[PDB]
Amino acid sequence: VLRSVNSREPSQVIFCNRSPRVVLPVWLNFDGEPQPYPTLPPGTGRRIHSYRGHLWLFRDAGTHDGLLVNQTELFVPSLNVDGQPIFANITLPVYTLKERCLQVVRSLVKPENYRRLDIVRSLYEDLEDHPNVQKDLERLTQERIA
Amino acid sequence: MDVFLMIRRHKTTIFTDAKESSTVFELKRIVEGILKRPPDEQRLYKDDQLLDDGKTLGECGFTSQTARPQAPATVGLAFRTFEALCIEPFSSPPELPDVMK
Amino acid sequence: MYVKLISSDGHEFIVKREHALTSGTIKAMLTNEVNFREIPSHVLSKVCMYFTYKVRYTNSSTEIPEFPIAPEIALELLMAANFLDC
Amino acid sequence: MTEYKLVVVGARGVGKSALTIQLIQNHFVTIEDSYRKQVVIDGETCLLDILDTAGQEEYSAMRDQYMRTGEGFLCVFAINNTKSFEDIHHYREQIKRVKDSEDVPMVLVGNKCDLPSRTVDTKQAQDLARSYGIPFIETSAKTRQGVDDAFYTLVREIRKHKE
Ligand SMILES: CC(C)[C@@H](C(=O)N1C[C@H](O)C[C@H]1C(=O)NCc1ccc2cnn(C)c2c1)n1nnc2c1CC[C@H](CCCN1CCCN(c3nccc(-c4noc([C@@]5(C)CCCc6sc(N)c(C#N)c65)n4)n3)[C@@H](C)C1)C2
Ligand SMILES: Nc1nc2c(ncn2[C@@H]2O[C@H](COP(=O)(O)OP(=O)(O)CP(=O)(O)O)[C@@H](O)[C@H]2O)c(=O)[nH]1
Ligand SMILES: [Mg+2]
Numbered sequence: 001v002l003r004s005v006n007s008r009e010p011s012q013v014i015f016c017n018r019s020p021r022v023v024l025p026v027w028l029n030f031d032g033e034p035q036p037y038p039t040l041p042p043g044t045g046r047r048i049h050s051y052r053g054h055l056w057l058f059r060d061a062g063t064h065d066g067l068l069v070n071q072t073e074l075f076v077p078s079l080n081v082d083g084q085p086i087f088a089n090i091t092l093p094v095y096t097l098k099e100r101c102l103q104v105v106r107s108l109v110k111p112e113n114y115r116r117l118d119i120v121r122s123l124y125e126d127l128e129d130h131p132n133v134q135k136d137l138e139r140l141t142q143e144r145i146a
Numbered sequence: 147m148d149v150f151l152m153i154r155r156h157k158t159t160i161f162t163d164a165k166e167s168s169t170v171f172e173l174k175r176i177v178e179g180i181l182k183r184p185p186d187e188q189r190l191y192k193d194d195q196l197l198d199d200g201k202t203l204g205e206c207g208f209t210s211q212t213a214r215p216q217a218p219a220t221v222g223l224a225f226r227t228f229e230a231l232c233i234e235p236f237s238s239p240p241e242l243p244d245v246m247k
Numbered sequence: 248m249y250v251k252l253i254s255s256d257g258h259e260f261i262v263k264r265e266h267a268l269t270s271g272t273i274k275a276m277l278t279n280e281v282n283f284r285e286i287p288s289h290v291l292s293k294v295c296m297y298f299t300y301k302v303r304y305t306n307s308s309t310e311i312p313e314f315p316i317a318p319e320i321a322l323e324l325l326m327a328a329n330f331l332d333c
Numbered sequence: 334m335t336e337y338k339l340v341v342v343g344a345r346g347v348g349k350s351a352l353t354i355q356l357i358q359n360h361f362v363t364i365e366d367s368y369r370k371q372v373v374i375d376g377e378t379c380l381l382d383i384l385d386t387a388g389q390e391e392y393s394a395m396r397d398q399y400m401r402t403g404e405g406f407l408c409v410f411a412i413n414n415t416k417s418f419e420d421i422h423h424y425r426e427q428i429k430r431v432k433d434s435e436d437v438p439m440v441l442v443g444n445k446c447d448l449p450s451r452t453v454d455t456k457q458a459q460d461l462a463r464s465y466g467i468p469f470i471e472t473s474a475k476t477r478q479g480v481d482d483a484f485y486t487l488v489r490e491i492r493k494h495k496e
Contacts, residue, residue, distance in 0.1 A: 020313050038429070159295075180261055239323065
């Protein structure tokens with residue numbers, strides 16, 4: 001249900017990685033499948049030639065963590081006015097303290113050694129639930145039911 | 147532009163914020179609003195240098211770059227016949243497990 | 248309005264109530280002083296820092312800094328972050 | 334002997350097929366096909382694999398990975414067709430997308446340099462090829478003018494890119 005519109009109307013966009021992570025641009029095609037694009041190093045910018053009605057979201061390139069664009073999880077380019085570009089600012093979200101701790105531990109322990117930790121079994125499962133994008137598309141559709 | 151700090155004395159620690167243009171004495175009124183002690187009986191320290199009651203917090207080295215909310219700056223506090231500034235350390239973290247080396 | 252959060256080694260942290268209300272566990276338990284029996288000071292001091300980081304950037308329109316976590320605290324902090332529901 | 338897969342992209346009628354036909358056979362004259370010729374570049378015998386793109390435009394997973402196989406690209410426009418020059422930007426976008434890199438061995442090629450009425454000035458193509466950081470060469474598929482130069486310079490870009 002969350003898919004890009006086949007507008008064929010160009011719209012110049014500026015992606016901007018204001019995150020300390022390596023950002024992975026994720027385009028939602030006309031069928032709803034997430035298609036990744038060349039990554040952005042931390043603190044860079046690129047003049048993307050996207051099209052109106054195209055869905056975008058951004059994730060950490062390696063850990064596939066969630067990231068915010070203009071203080072929201074999705075980006076649709078409008079129509080450029082007087083040739084001006086459209087700026088998409090990518091920032092970190094306020095990760096919950098639990099989720100932030102999981103991210104750090106996932107980056108220090110190999111997944112084979114998760115069970116060798118002295119944490120509770122409720123957290124052993126949370127470690128192995130690495131973020132997938134499909135469950136994020138599933139909730140985002142259910143979230144916009146109104 | 148706010149400056150985020152930790153007012154620490156003995157085993158007490160206050161997590162509050164203040165603008166960089168606010169006075170040290172103004173901060174002593176905030177400490178008074180928590181720790182029932184007047185500003186005439188307070189002695190604030192940035193590291194081990196006595197903060198003058200007239201200077202602004204920025205004039206003491208507290209900036210929004212060096213005093214982030216996720217890592218606030220420590221301000222020693224001495225109450226009163228004044229005491230010597232004494233900040234008790236936190237607990238020590240345990241040794242790193244071998245799986246996380 | 249300030250509340251008091253005491254660690255396991257007697258360290259008392261004074262923090263504003265709206266900052267401590269971030270924790271779902273602290274929210275339900277209050278009614279002005281809260282004690283913790285197994286959370287040490289070096290972990291509770293970091294949690295209080297997350298409360299400031301939370302309220303400061305939760306509606307920020309610009310970029311947000313990363314929340315730093317040292318490896319020696321990461322495992323103990325995850326236990327405290329799980330119990331507090333924050 | 335190492336092989337170099339070269340792709341020739343451009344607009345309709347800019348001389349993409351004609352450029353390859355001379356490089357292969359020295360025989361100026363009609364479908365999407367691939368040609369191979371063994372040439373010596375810089376005293377080094379190497380194999381050239383030229384794929385002349387043609388036909389309708391399509392962005393399928395088949396065609397993307399087929400273009401991904403190419404190691405270097407010739408972006409060809411006609412000097413008497415203003416659209417072909419202002420279309421070069423779109424070909425470079427897709428090249429950088431399928432290769433998933435902003436540094437791809439490329440070369441801007443201005444063909445049909447044997448006609449009297451040019452509508453695309455040489456200054457426009459030098460200012461554009463400078464912004465892309467790629468070499469520019471004026472070619473002519475009728476007179477072999479720079480036909481060897483256009484293909485050989487791309488091989489030097491791939492040998493430079495080798496990390
Ligand atoms: C289908 C998608 C490509 C998509 C699209 O563009 N998106 C989706 C997101 O919004 C972002 C945007 C996008 O990717 N930005 C590029 C980009 C690059 C880098 C980065 C890094 N980060 N990011 C985020 C990046 C984004 N999209 N959605 N709607 C449409 C499209 C694409 C364009 C569709 C309509 C164009 C109309 N044309 C017809 C007239 C003539 N034209 C023409 N005539 C003949 C051939 C070609 C041609 N072009 O390429 C090629 C080759 C052979 C060469 C080369 C490699 C490949 S590979 C492949 N399959 C090819 C083919 N056939 C080719 N030949 N062109 C061209 C100039 C216009 C409308
Ligand atoms: N004057 C001149 N005409 C040329 C040159 N190269 C090609 N042409 C002319 O361009 C026309 C089409 O060129 P062609 O080689 O088929 O181009 P193409 O890009 O392969 C076209 P398609 O994409 O449809 O396959 C032919 O009429 C041919 O005579 C050149 O260097 N000079
Ligand atoms: Mg042809």
